[PDB]
A paper describes a structure:
Hence, recombinant N-terminally His6-tagged MslAΔTrp21, which lacked the C-terminal Trp21, and MslA Trp21G variants, with an achiral glycine instead of Trp21, were prepared by co-expression with MslB1 in E. coli. As a result, the X-ray crystal structures of the MslH:MslAΔTrp21 and MslH:MslA Trp21G complexes at 2.29 Å and 2.12 Å resolutions, respectively, with one monomer in the asymmetric unit, which are the same as the MslH:apo structure, were successfully obtained. The electron density of MslAΔTrp21 in the MslH:MslAΔTrp21 crystal structure allowed us to locate a cyclic peptide molecule (cMslA Gly12-Phe20), consisting of the Gly12-Phe20 part on the C-terminal side of MslAΔTrp21 with a disulfide bond between Cys13 and Cys19, in the large cleft conformed by two monomers. However, no electron density corresponding to either the MslA leader peptide or MslB1 was identified in the MslH:MslAΔTrp21 crystal structure. The cMslA Gly12-Phe20 of MslAΔTrp21 molecule is accommodated in the cleft with various interactions, such as a σ–π interaction between Phe228 of monomer A and Tyr15 in cMslA Gly12-Phe20 (3.8 Å), hydrophobic interactions between α6’ of monomer B and MslA Ala16-Val18, and polar interactions between Gly60 (3.4 Å)/His295 (2.7 Å) in MslH and the carboxyl group of the C-terminal MslA Phe20 of MslAΔTrp21. In addition, an architecture that would construct a six-coordination motif, consisting of four amino acid residues Glu44, Asn87, His259, and His261 and two water molecules (w1 and w2), was detected around the C-terminal carboxyl group of MslA Phe20 in the MslH:MslAΔTrp21 crystal structure. In the six-coordination, the w2 water molecule hydrogen-bonds with the side-chain of Asp11 and is further held in the structure by the steric contraction of the His295 side-chain, which forms a hydrogen-bond with Asp11. The in vitro enzymatic reaction indicated that the catalytic activity was maintained in MslH expressed in M9 medium, as in the case of the recombinant MslH expressed in Luria-Bertani (LB) medium.
Author numbering:
A (entry chain A), B (entry chain A), C (entry chain A): 1 to 208, 211 to 439
D (entry chain B), E (entry chain B), F (entry chain B), G (entry chain B): 12 to 20
Amino acid sequence: MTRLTVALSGDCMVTRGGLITSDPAAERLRDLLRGTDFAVTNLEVVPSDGRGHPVHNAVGGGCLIADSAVLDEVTAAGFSVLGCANNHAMDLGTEGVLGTMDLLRARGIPYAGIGADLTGARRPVYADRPGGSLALLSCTATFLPGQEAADPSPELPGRPGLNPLRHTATMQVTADQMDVLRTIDAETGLRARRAEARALLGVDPALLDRLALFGTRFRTADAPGFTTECDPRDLDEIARWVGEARLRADLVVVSVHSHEPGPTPETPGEFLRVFAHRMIDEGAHAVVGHGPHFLRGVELYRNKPIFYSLGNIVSQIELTDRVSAEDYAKVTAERPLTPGRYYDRLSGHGTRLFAPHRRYWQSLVPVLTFEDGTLTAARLHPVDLGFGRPVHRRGRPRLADRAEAEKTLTDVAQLSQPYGTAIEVMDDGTGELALDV
Amino acid sequence: MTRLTVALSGDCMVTRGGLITSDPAAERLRDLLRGTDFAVTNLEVVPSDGRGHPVHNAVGGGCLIADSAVLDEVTAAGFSVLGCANNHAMDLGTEGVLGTMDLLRARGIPYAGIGADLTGARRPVYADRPGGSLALLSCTATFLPGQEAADPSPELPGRPGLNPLRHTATMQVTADQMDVLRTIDAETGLRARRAEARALLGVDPALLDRLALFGTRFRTADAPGFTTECDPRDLDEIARWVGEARLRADLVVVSVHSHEPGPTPETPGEFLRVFAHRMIDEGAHAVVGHGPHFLRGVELYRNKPIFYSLGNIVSQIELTDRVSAEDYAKVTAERPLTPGRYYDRLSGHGTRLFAPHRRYWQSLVPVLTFEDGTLTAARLHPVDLGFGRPVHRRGRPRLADRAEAEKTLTDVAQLSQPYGTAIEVMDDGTGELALDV
Amino acid sequence: MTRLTVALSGDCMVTRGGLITSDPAAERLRDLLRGTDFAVTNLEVVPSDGRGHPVHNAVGGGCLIADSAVLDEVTAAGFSVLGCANNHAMDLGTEGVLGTMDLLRARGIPYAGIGADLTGARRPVYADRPGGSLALLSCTATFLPGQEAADPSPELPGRPGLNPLRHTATMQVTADQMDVLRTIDAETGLRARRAEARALLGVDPALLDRLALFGTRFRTADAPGFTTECDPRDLDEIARWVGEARLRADLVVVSVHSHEPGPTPETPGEFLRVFAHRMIDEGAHAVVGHGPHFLRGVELYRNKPIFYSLGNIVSQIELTDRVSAEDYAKVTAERPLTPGRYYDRLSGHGTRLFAPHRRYWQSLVPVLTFEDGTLTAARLHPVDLGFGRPVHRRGRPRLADRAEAEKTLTDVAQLSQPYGTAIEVMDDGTGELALDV
Amino acid sequence: GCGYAIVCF
Amino acid sequence: GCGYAIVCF
Amino acid sequence: GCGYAIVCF
Amino acid sequence: GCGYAIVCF
Ligand SMILES: [Ca+2]
Ligand SMILES: [Ca+2]
Ligand SMILES: [Ca+2]
């Protein structure tokens, strides 16, 4: 009956024009994206005509702001539905995110994940085509506290911001380790400095056999360990909107931004896996993840795919022309710096950060085919971002050649093996997931 | 030659009209304030006509927003120079603080501590009278990270915000306590989750014999202890502007907001004392502190006074008509709440928070007399905020009657005794500091 | 690997529509410009919808202001990157140059050389195409003092303006000539009128064996002579941005406006040659000059071309419809003048200024080919501007016919001979530089 | 932004 | 806002 | 702003 | 704009 194709991708950190080069492998990527019914990416950059003020985002790597003309590069390349909840959408504050919504709506680009209040950030966006409709929901587990949007009260408006997926981490420690922690709390004088809060609240907010010291949760356990768990409010609220989107579109896609690592850098946080299973339990047809800037595994759960990380589809951080004063201060200089010189110094003249490692310059574009909601095909198109090229050329995407596509498909297979995922490989280096249907 | 009088006060948390009642003791307070050359207070509330969006400030006790008409109550009561750097000036975000600056300038009220960028927040404001001039600088050590203002770069504007006095706390632990902390770091799996940051930065950001675990600084020492120290950039920058103000006014007053407790709730943070000494070293004639909502000691340093905390001069938190949705969520309710009901539930129907304790409803208004920069008199006027009165009446200030003024003057003397400060007491309950001049 | 073509041209003084006529030689010029990857010209006219006020620019020949619709003529003709730093961009003041930036950005035209502050005027603009990117920097050595842009201070904004290349001229005189100059200074009473400045500054600002009289620098030398030298700040600052542009684009082009003559009208100023060598030393791939309204020589320096002057690509000064009152005053008239009559009288009914001489109506459009930054071809296309035609038709460009193209190519060869430049000549009158690669 | 005092109401 | 990973560049 | 050339038309 | 006086502070 209804047959729809969806292209997925990761972080779109675009800061310059000419996104699709004259390379035939790059033009074939645009042809691939244009040929689908819907093409989703995560706008990991603030398009701006000047509205707002830079926030201090040292932990996110600095501000990521670009001329709003980059939005024409995104649409001309083939992307048609935008997820905006990430740790950079608020780089220009509440006024910046209101400016982003204005820019996207004036260009007729559907988006989700940000809004003038919390409900607007949580809502799905519905993209309608002659062949059918797709609902996109977008959330992020990585952001500066306070950047989440807020809903209005009877007396005050809401707050523009992002759709949050909060989570808590608990340290499991032995009883003897717990006793030393409380000993350190008492003997340093730290417990004495909570005496006022004890009188005002009536309780010591550090005794919960839980315990909250140094802004971290500790719990007595038989063996040391580390746990993560999604905020119940965010999980139930996002799931609520997923069930709503299921009634009003053929396909529901949940895009989640998450930098958080599991026990290993390539594994997702345990909470993120619980989140993705819940989204499919509620009716989502796919979960697309991003954040780490490298690829993570792919899981098939109840015959629906979870892409824990598609990495970067566009990577032009080092080419941004808008560096904030607080960002400049992170580099000690004997003379005022130009942006390119600042990024060269920040990376130690290229010897650290993302440039030296190949994992940050390989990507993947899945193309999913659905027939009345059933996944019938999941093609995998490896993407090359130009590792080792000059800074002004690396970061633009093109379909990887045969040899490098095969290495990328091998990585994906190895990263997805713990989930029982198998891949068929074509002669050109592209592949597809082995499905049970 | 030049003789000037300065009235000082603490937190002005005004949310209603009729600030000065028909009580003769309240009208005499207005007469006292009006009779000085300059009257300084800390505007601990966002006056607003609607511009901005509420930020999440749970740690500050919620949002503190009021009708801008309260500014007429502040000036009619006698206050004439306003310090605005505190942990509530950003309760409506960057747009709110820009709206506050607009409101203050349209009413011709001199202010300092906030600005459209960092320099503007650091600048002194110069209040000129026929008898002479006073320079006010205002900073805060308590605020949500990111709320500090930012200066512009060649490519991006600054960020509106407050004048910050940042500080770091270090836990001194024994070597055996340090070994258990690193053991907990390794055995829980926490050290494993920094593996990516180790590759990107080239170092483990937790090994500094310093150490940074759980977002807290640890240092090996012979005995456990607790240290605090001002951020060197903020200390040098604020001191720089103090020396500038010294050249352009008779009197330089530094107002610093600080909730941070010392070893005991009544003692200031060690960093705050270093800050106050530095301000007078640089040429300030007085340092007025606030934040804790109760009184702290008074110190005479190089014949200049340091008031570590003057408490509240106006306390009408529970009467605010603008409660944000995130604030409402902190109280579990079976029905939507009105503001007054919300505050009643938040305080456990009056059995906790500030209402049960008398220290939160006594205040002090010092009146300093300077002659060519030399302190010649420091009168102390105890102020009563109506402990035990109904919520709609407590928080308005009046000169305390004889009996309660004497008890307040005794508290101040006891809180100032560790600094060697002596007080003379008048028959009406007012007093003055014993000076060496 | 990367192969890019760049068309260069001189002053674009366009004031009317129909820039490209139905002449096949003019349509072939548009085809040539459209066929390159980038086409650069110097916008020597203020496009305006009415914003700003005319400045007094008698020395520049009057105001040069046109309907903003001429920008559509510029882009339709094939020009795609605009250099704006010249001695007419400020003809409508700071408000006019802000209006020009608005007009160019609303039409999506990349530009450089002007900005809201000095940094913005110094920045390169990056033009991205599928085949690669070009960075354009634009400066001017000819402008009214004060028209240069200014950067902001902590308390005041910058000033919109142009990117300056300042320079100083020193007169070398014999010791006996120097003694007469100081004698004239003393005996006329001129030295007496600096008595106040001597007391205020503590020195006589005329004794530097340097010497500054009559707003001119004099130096004792063995033989009389004339020297020029670039301002060290401007040279180092422009070079700094050139090195920045080198990191972020394949090709860096520096466009410099300079009317200043050398010992002969056809030779460039000595400072301009030092500037051009420095630009290529810093990494620029080409230096395009303009200003004099006639052609100057071409130099190959380290295998990169320097075009000291490409003259006019469009010359419609006498057709402007917007003549200022101060401009009108330069022509004594017994009745109020219409623009065309004013220009006829100003040129003495065509017997002086630019119309009588053929050098002001020949031009050149170089087309450079680069392969991975190496110059592989430099084609030369002579352009005819219609010498001797009626005023309403001369000034529109077309590819010169064979006979006149040959004469223009001969001029270029003779003007470039002192630099050792050789030219190959085709049968149609076009040519190309002899390269060492 | 209220590290060791926890409460800064 | 990047508790245990420290870096989320 | 046209010191020795005098004319910069 | 301060030809022979040089300084017009
Ligand atoms: Ca991210
Ligand atoms: Ca406070
Ligand atoms: Ca010119």
